[PDB]
Design a binder for this molecule. Structure first.
Ligand SMILES: CC(C)(C)c1ccccc1
Ligand SMILES: CC(C)(C)c1ccccc1
Length: 9
């Protein structure tokens, strides 16, 4: 999940 969201940054 972390990667899925982190892509924003
Ligand atoms: C630790 C998080 C998931 C916030 C992150 C990892 C790698 C690049 C950007 C964010
Ligand atoms: C340090 C960066 C943000 C390049 C990173 C750490 C862990 C996973 C993916 C990227």
């Amino acid at each position: 999940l972390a990667a899925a969201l982190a892509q924003a940054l």
